[PDB]
Amino acid sequence: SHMVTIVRIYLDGVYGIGKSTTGRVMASAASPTLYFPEPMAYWRTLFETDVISGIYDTQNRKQQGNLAVDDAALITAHYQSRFTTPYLILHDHTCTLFGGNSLQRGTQPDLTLVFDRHPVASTVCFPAARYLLGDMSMCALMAMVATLPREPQGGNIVVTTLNVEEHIRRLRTRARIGEQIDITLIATLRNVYFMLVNTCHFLRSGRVWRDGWGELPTSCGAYKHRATQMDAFQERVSPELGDTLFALFKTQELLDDRGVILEVHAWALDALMLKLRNLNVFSADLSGTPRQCAAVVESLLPLMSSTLSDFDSASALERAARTFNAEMGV
Amino acid sequence: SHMVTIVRIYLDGVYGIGKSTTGRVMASAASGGSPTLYFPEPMAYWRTLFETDVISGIYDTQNDAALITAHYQSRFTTPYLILHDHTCTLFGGNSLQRGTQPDLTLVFDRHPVASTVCFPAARYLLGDMSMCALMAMVATLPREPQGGNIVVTTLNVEEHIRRLRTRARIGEQIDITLIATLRNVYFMLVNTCHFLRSGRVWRDGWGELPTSCGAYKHRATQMDAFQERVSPELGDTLFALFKTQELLDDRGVILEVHAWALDALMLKLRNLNVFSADLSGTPRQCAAVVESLLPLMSSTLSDFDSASALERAARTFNAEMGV
Ligand SMILES: Nc1ncnc2c1ncn2[C@@H]1O[C@H](COP(=O)(O)OP(=O)(O)O)[C@@H](O)[C@H]1O
Ligand SMILES: Nc1ncnc2c1ncn2[C@@H]1O[C@H](COP(=O)(O)OP(=O)(O)O)[C@@H](O)[C@H]1O
Ligand SMILES: Cc1cn([C@H]2C[C@H](O)[C@@H](CO)O2)c(=O)[nH]c1=O
Ligand SMILES: Cc1cn([C@H]2C[C@H](O)[C@@H](CO)O2)c(=O)[nH]c1=O
Numbered sequence: 001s002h003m004v005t006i007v008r009i010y011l012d013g014v015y016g017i018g019k020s021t022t023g024r025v026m027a028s029a030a031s032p033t034l035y036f037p038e039p040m041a042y043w044r045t046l047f048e049t050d051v052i053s054g055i056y057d058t059q060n061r062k063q064q065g066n067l068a069v070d071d072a073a074l075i076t077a078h079y080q081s082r083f084t085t086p087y088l089i090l091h092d093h094t095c096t097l098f099g100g101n102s103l104q105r106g107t108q109p110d111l112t113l114v115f116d117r118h119p120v121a122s123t124v125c126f127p128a129a130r131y132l133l134g135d136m137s138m139c140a141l142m143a144m145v146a147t148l149p150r151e152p153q154g155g156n157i158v159v160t161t162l163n164v165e166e167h168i169r170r171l172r173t174r175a176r177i178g179e180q181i182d183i184t185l186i187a188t189l190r191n192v193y194f195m196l197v198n199t200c201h202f203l204r205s206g207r208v209w210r211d212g213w214g215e216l217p218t219s220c221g222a223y224k225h226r227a228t229q230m231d232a233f234q235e236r237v238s239p240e241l242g243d244t245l246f247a248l249f250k251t252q253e254l255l256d257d258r259g260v261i262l263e264v265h266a267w268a269l270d271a272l273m274l275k276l277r278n279l280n281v282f283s284a285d286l287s288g289t290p291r292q293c294a295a296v297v298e299s300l301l302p303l304m305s306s307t308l309s310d311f312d313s314a315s316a317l318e319r320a321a322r323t324f325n326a327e328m329g330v
Numbered sequence: 331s332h333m334v335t336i337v338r339i340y341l342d343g344v345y346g347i348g349k350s351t352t353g354r355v356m357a358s359a360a361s362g363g364s365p366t367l368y369f370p371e372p373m374a375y376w377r378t379l380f381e382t383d384v385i386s387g388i389y390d391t392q393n394d395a396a397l398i399t400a401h402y403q404s405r406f407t408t409p410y411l412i413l414h415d416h417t418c419t420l421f422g423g424n425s426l427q428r429g430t431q432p433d434l435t436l437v438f439d440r441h442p443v444a445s446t447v448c449f450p451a452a453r454y455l456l457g458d459m460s461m462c463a464l465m466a467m468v469a470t471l472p473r474e475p476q477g478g479n480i481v482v483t484t485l486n487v488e489e490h491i492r493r494l495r496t497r498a499r500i501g502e503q504i505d506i507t508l509i510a511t512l513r514n515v516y517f518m519l520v521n522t523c524h525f526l527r528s529g530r531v532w533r534d535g536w537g538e539l540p541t542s543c544g545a546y547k548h549r550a551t552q553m554d555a556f557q558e559r560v561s562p563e564l565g566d567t568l569f570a571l572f573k574t575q576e577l578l579d580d581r582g583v584i585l586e587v588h589a590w591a592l593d594a595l596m597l598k599l600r601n602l603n604v605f606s607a608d609l610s611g612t613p614r615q616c617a618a619v620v621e622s623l624l625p626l627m628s629s630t631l632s633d634f635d636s637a638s639a640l641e642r643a644a645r646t647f648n649a650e651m652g653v
Contacts, residue, residue, distance in 0.1 A: 042587065047462040047576070071398065078401040081466050088469040089587060092594035139380040143404050146411040147470040253380065263646045264375065264412060271415035323586045 004314040006098055006154075007109040007306045010118035010279075011297070012125075012196075013160035014189040015179075016171035018286040018293060022160070023114045025294040033112040034321035039086035041329040044177075053178035055079040059135065076130060077140035084122040084147060090324065091119050091149050097317050099309030102154035102278070106302045111314055113321070118157055120276070123148040125196060128248065129188045132227045138253045142268060151278040154307035158282045158297055159197050164190075164230065166287055184228055191233040198239035199246065200281035205238065209269050212241035218259075219250045235283055245272070280305045332634040336421060336477075337364070337432040337627050340441035340602075341620065342448075342519075343483030344512040346494040348609040348616060352483070353437045355617035363621045364435040367644040369417075371439045372409030374651045389505075392458065399453060400463035407445035407470060413647065414442050414472050420640050422632035425477035425601070429625045434637060436644075437620075441480055443599070446471040448519055451571065452511040455550045461576045465591060474601040477630035481605045481620055482520050487513065487553060489610060507551060514556040521562035522569065523604030528561075532572075532592045535564035541582070542573050558606055568595070603628045 011019045020038060027035030044050045058075050061067040067075070127144035130136040162170070167190075171181060217223075226232050227248070236243050246269060254265045282300050286293045309317075341349050350371060355361050357368035377383045388402035417436075450467040453459040485493075490513075494504050540546070549555050550571070559566045569592060577588040584592075605623050609616045632640075 039587075046585070046587075047460070049460075049462065071394070074401045075394065075397050078397045078404070078463075081401070081404055082462065085466045085469045086587065089591050089594065092469075092597075093590040137381070139382065139405065139408075140401075143408045146408050146415070262379070262650055264372075264409065264650050267416040268412050271412065274415075274419075327585055327587050 003099070003308040003310060004111055005105070005107070005109045005306050006111045006113065006309050006314065006317075007301055007304045008098060008113040008115065008154065008156060009297070009304070010115045010155070010157045011160065012117045012121050012157055013193055014167070014186060016174055016186070017160045017162045017167060018170060018290070019160050020116055021290050022284075022286060022293040022297060023116050025290045026112075026114055026297060031294065031298075032110070033114060034318060036090065036113070036115045036321055036324050037328050037330045038116045039090070039324075039328045041327060042086040043083065045329070049082075050178070051079050051082045056178060056180035059180060073136055073140065076135050077137075077143065080122070080127055080130060080136070080140075080144060081147075083126065084119065084144065086328075087117065087119040087122050088147070088149065090115075094317065094320060095149075095152055097309060097313040097320070098152065098154055099307040099313060100153060101308040102305045104280075104304065105306050107306070108301065109306050111317070112301065113317065118151075118155075118279070119149055120157075120196065120279075124245065124272070125189070125192050128195075128245065129185065129192050132188050132192070132224050132248065133184065134224070138251060142265075145272060146268060148272065148275050150275045153278050154305045155278045156280045156282065156304045157200070158284050158300065159193055160286050161235075161283050162286050183230075187230040188228045190230070191227050192245075194233035194235055195243065195245045195248075197235050197281055197283055198233070199244040200276060200279055201236065202239045202241070202244045202246075203273060203276060204281070207241075209241070209244075209246040209273055213246075213250065216241055216247060216250050218252065218255075219248050220252065223248065334434065334632045334634055334637040335428070335430075335432045335629050336434055336436060336632050336637065336640075337624055337629045338421060338436040338438065338477065338479060339620070339627070340438040340478065340480045341483065342440050342444055342480055343516055344490070344509060346509065347483045347485045347490055348493060348613070349483050350439055351613050352609060352616040352620060353439055355613045356435070356437050356620060361614065361617045361621070364432055364624065366435040366437055367641060368437045369413065369439055369644055369647050370651055372413070372647075372651050374653065375409035376406065378653070396458065396460060396463065400459050400466065403445070403450050403453060403459070403463075403467060406449065407442065407467070409651075410440065410442040410445050411470070411472060413438075417640065417643060418472075418475050420632060420636040420643070421475065421477055422630045422636060423476060424631040425628045427603075427626065428629050431624065432629050435621075435624070436640065441474075441478075441602070442472055443480075443519065447568065447595075448512065448515050451518075451568065452508060452515045455511050455515070455547050455571065456508065457547070461574060465588075468595055469591060471595065471598050473598045476601050477628045478601045479603045479605065479623075479627045480523070481607050481623065482516050483609050484558070484606050485609045510553040511551045513554075514550055514552070515568075517556040517558055518566065518568045518570075520604060520606055521556075521559050522567040523599060523602055524559065525562045525564070525567050526596060526599060527604065530564075532564070532567075532569040532596055536569075536573065536584075539564055539570060539573055541575065541578075542571050543575070546571065
């Protein structure tokens with residue numbers, strides 16, 4: 001007759017921190033929780049091109065002078081678009097199923113979903129990092145950001161954190177895929193994920209991207225340099241506009257002669273703001289063992305938004321996790 | 331707060347037929363009928379706002395290529411996604427076919443389906459883009475909220491190419507092969523919507539359908555090969571091109587992840603009340619043909635503040651997207 005209480009979590013963050021490991025443990029019968037893995041097979045094997053080696057190979061052939069730059073920036077953008085696809089497909093498939101009545105009930109849910117990354121990772125975070133590093137243009141970044149899907153009510157995002165030394169240790173330990181392992185990339189990603197956390201805190205504080213936009217300095221070469229510096233950003237209690245994702249958009253490329261952002265670009269920021277609204281944000285330190293890491297995330301559950309879904313939707317969710325694990329190489 | 335009834339129309343179709351001219355006439359007070367707001371093609375976004383001109387860029391690419399082409403097609407979609415995100419908060423709900431004249435009409439020059447689906451599909455069919463690239467684009471189609479109407483422009487190909495010629499320099503070539511394919515693709519679009527409106531789903535006839543290989547792609551680029559169907563079958567729709575080996579397992583069964591992509595496409599198109607409109611008349615007559623469809627179109631219930639925001643949006647988009 002009645003409803004299933006669901007809490008959904010997107011575990012997200014810089015690669016190499018331990019998010020996937022944590023997610024599998026949480027889902028393990030050793031501790032009812034479903035886990036949706038990174039869509040590895042979609043990225044690597046389902047098509048003729050592997051996007052992870054492709055994106056690194058592009059910067060390699062950029063360095064070796066075989067790729068004219070210019071073209072590299074365009075190809076880099078295209079590989080980055082391909083990362084998003086399976087996230088967009090999964091989000092489209094699951095978003096009808098969670099149900100409504102988002103509330104912080106403080107109870108154990110009937111069903112917990114753990115998604116490995118939210119779409120914001122491939123549409124915003126990784127693209128923003130590539131932009132800040134000079135691997136991609138603002139135009140290419142806009143193109144990715146515009147494809148972010150709106151999160152419906154009840155979303156929770158848990159951004160993983162880890163001290164730099166242990167992060168480097170762990171990056172050393174991942175299997176060889178042909179992935180780009182670059183400490184400037186890592187530094188930048190780490191800063192961008194703090195910007196994300198800060199954006200969410202900024203919005204929940206009742207502010208909007210125009211609040212402090214005037215007084216904000218133009219974000220040019222100097223801004224980009226600082227965003228690539230290890231530990232230049234951190235999670236803030238009350239963030240400033242300058243601590244969020246919005247700040248990197250106050251660049252000359254996006255303003256008229258008189259210094260004023262075009263309305264069409266302002267719309268792009270309004271959209272970004274609205275799409276993040278339903279993400280209840282948390283951070284989790286992963287310095288512990290896998291078991292302690294999962295416990296850290298689990299201790300957040302009673303703080304999270306739950307929705308009310310019906311039996312048939314919850315069943316479709318179980319089938320979705322089963323299918324996705326199977327087809328993605330779990 | 332005071333209630334306002336809106337009909338919105340995405341006028342769409344192959345470039346060169348007369349869509350933009352028609353929409354400008356509709357917006358003009360001289361066409362009478364309903365007070366109409368027109369949203370043009372995002373020309374400046376494509377051509378002048380950034381360093382790279384994507385129109386020149388995509389055509390120059392064909393003159394690694396497959397990846398650059400996919401990225402240019404991505405950039406076409408951007409301003410459409412932004413505009414759709416902005417305006418969808420203003421249309422309101424309570425979609426119905428009311429039969430009566432709305433308080434105002436919106437005319438959008440193209441729907442997001444053009445840049446995320448139709449043009450990518452044409453490029454894929456011509457071997458200029460991979461299926462993987464096509465999926466990437468299709469996945470970014472936004473869901474149409476209740477009350478959308480789409481009008482696909484049609485025109486005999488002879489007059490279509492004539493229109494492109496008048497406008498073209500005095501020795502400038504026309505990509506006849508691309509235009510031939512896009513005309514078929516837009517018929518597939520029309521057929522897809524008719525197909526969905528009849529309560530059918532992409533799975534209907536999927537098994538019986540031949541895999542869409544070399545022969546399918548030949549037919550798809552063939553001038554006049556497709557048309558608007560009274561009663562479309564699956565093979566007349568956009569769904570058919572997706573039954574390809576690239577998307578199937580060993581047993582020739584579509585992977586569930588790809589099936590989900592097709593479900594999403596199907597749902598995203600649901601709220602598009604579909605029409606076609608012949609544009610062989612003068613611009614005044616073309617505007618009248620499109621406007622005569624209003625009694626059959628969905629309208630929504632918005633309000634004065636949101637309608638006012640739509641007028642500002644139209645004013646702004648027209649200004650910022652110009653030359
Ligand atoms: N809690 C942990 N303690 C020690 N090593 C870990 C821990 N979590 C993950 N690792 C190791 O670090 C590497 C990256 O972990 P992974 O789960 O792939 O990170 P992510 O999913 O964040 O990219 C793997 O080699 C993994 O075995
Ligand atoms: N109704 C019409 N009759 C004759 N020529 C037309 C008509 N409508 C448009 N044209 C011309 O045809 C060309 C294509 O028109 P345009 O409105 O740009 O088409 P589209 O928006 O479909 O790409 C233009 O040169 C235009 O002046
Ligand atoms: C999600 C995502 C991952 N990656 C990279 C980081 C890792 O090397 C690998 C798996 O996350 O793919 C991107 O380059 N872009 C993305 O959008
Ligand atoms: C909307 C759209 C237009 N075009 C081209 C066709 C015309 O030459 C020009 C303007 O519509 O841009 C694309 O290549 N892709 C697209 O997605």
